[PDB]
Design an enzyme around this catalytic site. Structure first.
Site, short mmCIF file in Angstrom:
data_model
loop_
_atom_site.label_atom_id
_atom_site.label_comp_id
_atom_site.label_asym_id
_atom_site.label_seq_id
_atom_site.Cartn_x
_atom_site.Cartn_y
_atom_site.Cartn_z
N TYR A 191 29.60 18.66 -21.62
CA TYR A 191 30.63 17.94 -21.18
C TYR A 191 30.85 16.65 -22.29
O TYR A 191 30.21 16.76 -23.17
CB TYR A 191 30.52 17.34 -19.69
CG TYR A 191 29.08 17.07 -19.46
CD1 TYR A 191 28.45 15.91 -19.92
CD2 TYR A 191 28.38 17.99 -18.57
CE1 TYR A 191 26.86 15.62 -19.59
CE2 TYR A 191 27.06 17.64 -18.10
CZ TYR A 191 26.45 16.45 -18.90
OH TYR A 191 25.27 16.16 -18.61
N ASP A 221 15.43 12.58 -21.70
CA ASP A 221 16.49 12.38 -21.94
C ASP A 221 16.87 11.14 -23.10
O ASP A 221 17.36 10.23 -23.01
CB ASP A 221 17.22 11.91 -20.89
CG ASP A 221 17.78 12.88 -19.91
OD1 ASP A 221 16.93 13.79 -19.82
OD2 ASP A 221 18.85 12.72 -19.12
N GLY A 255 18.42 8.32 -21.10
CA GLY A 255 19.64 8.36 -20.78
C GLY A 255 20.39 7.47 -21.59
O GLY A 255 19.99 6.71 -22.50
N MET A 311 24.15 19.48 -22.00
CA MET A 311 25.36 18.53 -21.63
C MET A 311 26.65 18.95 -22.09
O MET A 311 27.08 18.58 -23.31
CB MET A 311 24.78 17.23 -22.25
CG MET A 311 23.56 16.50 -21.52
SD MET A 311 23.12 14.96 -22.29
CE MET A 311 22.67 15.42 -23.76
N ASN A 332 0.80 -1.42 -0.07
CA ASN A 332 0.06 0.02 -0.13
C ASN A 332 0.66 1.13 -0.01
O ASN A 332 0.27 2.54 -0.22
CB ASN A 332 -0.86 0.02 1.14
CG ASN A 332 -2.19 -1.03 1.12
OD1 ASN A 332 -2.34 -1.42 -0.21
ND2 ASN A 332 -2.57 -1.44 2.14
N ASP A 363 11.63 14.92 -17.17
CA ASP A 363 12.85 15.37 -17.69
C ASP A 363 13.28 14.37 -18.81
O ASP A 363 13.60 13.04 -18.64
CB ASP A 363 14.22 15.55 -16.87
CG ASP A 363 15.40 15.70 -17.50
OD1 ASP A 363 15.55 16.65 -18.43
OD2 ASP A 363 16.33 14.88 -17.41
N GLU A 391 18.82 10.55 -26.24
CA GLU A 391 20.03 10.57 -26.94
C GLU A 391 20.30 9.68 -28.22
O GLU A 391 20.82 8.51 -27.83
CB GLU A 391 21.23 10.43 -25.67
CG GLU A 391 20.99 11.53 -24.55
CD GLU A 391 21.69 11.22 -23.48
OE1 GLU A 391 22.98 10.54 -23.62
OE2 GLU A 391 21.42 11.26 -22.32
#
Length: 391
Positions: A205, A135, A96, A203, A69, A133, A137
């Site tokens: 990086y 993601d 991701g 992103m 529950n 969100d 890719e």
């Protein structure tokens, strides 16, 4: 008062090897948590990728009943954090670089997109999230780029309807992780996507790594015109591209790495390398809190907003952000009027004064310079009794 966002990814596998729990998240320096990752089936169904970490694990203080529950795991912990910090928003990140999600198939049909949107909003309504969100890719051609627009539109419509009927008119959030590589972002229909998005997490990086022939900076702000091979990419080029396509500056969030990328058998930036060596959780990638290595010297390139450690004896270079570089990127955020900062991922940061998150928040102006919008606590449609009651 500028109200910058301070956003960070918490990955649901951090509770294992990384020994990093939601109670360790630096929520006193963050405005948004991105909880990663939910997976996508080919029929469009969004689902939790790790039931143990997400909803089943019993943390200290949790009941040990199993009549199903109530929710536990990291989800309950994140809901507790939302109670303590009313300006902390928690989003569910979907996708991701996990090889566990099929976006292309569901996003290409109306039925797939509605299955995606309805299953994701049900997750939000059951688990107490402030938004979603996305993601993906990455969209690889024009057909997928249009499908990305149609998918975002469908999610936005269903989030709006949920907010109207069960959120007391709350505008729940919809964000995206987006690429800094020209070949990728030039494929997107940026202005069309922007209609449905609250902000874009850039992103900024992984600009250089094992796939290269020469060592390079992985997250530099600006190109190194004196030696361009050492900067295969640069953030400023991507920011200008999104700005030109019509995205307001305050909707662009500057992603930053809490990790370093290593190059072995190299003379330095722009020079050939052979291999990436070891790492924290994958070869060639080191947690920021494991850097700089003992015996290596740290170089700061204020000209391009980058830094690196170099051990001449071992011929090893590691591209990572020092606090000085984090402050440069914070100055960049304020100078460009960007929406704030994003980090991947929370487990990698140092504690104390060397924390990159705390360093950026300071350079942005401190706590008073952060977004103060309140989160949402009431989820009356949840299947879980403790979510409905509010813990």
């Amino acid at each position: 008062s500028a109200e910058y966002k301070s956003i960070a990814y918490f990955v649901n596998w951090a509770i294992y090897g990384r020994n990093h729990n939601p109670q360790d998240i630096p929520i006193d320096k963050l405005t948004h948590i991105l909880y990663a990752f939910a997976n996508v089936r080919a029929n469009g169904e969004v689902y939790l990728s790790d039931p143990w970490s997400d909803i089943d694990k019993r943390f200290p203080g949790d009941s040990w009943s199993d009549t199903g529950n109530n929710v536990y795991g990291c989800v309950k912990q994140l809901n507790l954090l939302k109670q303590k910090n009313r300006n902390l928003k928690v989003l569910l990140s979907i996708g991701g670089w996990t090889y566990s999600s099929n976006f292309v198939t569901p996003a290409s049909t109306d039925q797939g997109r509605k299955t995606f949107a309805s299953s994701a909003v049900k997750l939000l309504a059951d688990l107490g999230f402030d938004g979603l969100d996305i993601d993906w890719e990455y969209p690889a051609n024009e057909a997928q780029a249009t499908d990305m627009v149609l998918l975002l539109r469908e999610i936005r419509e269903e989030l709006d309807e949920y907010g109207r009927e069960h959120g007391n008119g709350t505008h729940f959030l919809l964000s995206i992780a987006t690429s800094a590589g020209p070949s990728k972002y030039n494929t997107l229909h940026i202005s069309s996507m922007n209609l449905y998005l609250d902000f874009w997490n850039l992103m900024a990086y992984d600009y250089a790594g094992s796939w290269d022939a020469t060592a390079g900076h992985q997250a530099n702000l600006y190109p190194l015109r004196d030696d361009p091979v050492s900067t295969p990419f640069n953030t400023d080029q991507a920011i200008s591209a999104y700005l030109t396509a019509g995205v307001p500056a305050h909707k662009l969030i500057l992603g930053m790495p809490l990790y370093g990328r290593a190059f072995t058998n190299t003379d330095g930036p722009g020079k050939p390398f052979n291999g990436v060596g070891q790492g924290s959780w994958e070869n060639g990638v080191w947690d920021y809190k494991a850097l700089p290595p003992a015996g290596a010297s740290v170089s700061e390139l204020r000209s391009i907003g980058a830094s690196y450690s170099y051990d001449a004896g071992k011929k090893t270079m590691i591209s990572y952000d020092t606090p000085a570089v984090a402050r440069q990127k914070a100055d960049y955020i304020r100078s460009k009027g960007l929406g704030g900062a994003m980090w991947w991922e929370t487990s990698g940061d140092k504690v104390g004064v060397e924390s990159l998150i705390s360093t950026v928040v300071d350079s942005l102006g401190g706590i008073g310079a952060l977004d103060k919008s309140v989160n949402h606590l009431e989820y009356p449609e949840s299947q879980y009794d403790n979510v409905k009651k509010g813990f």
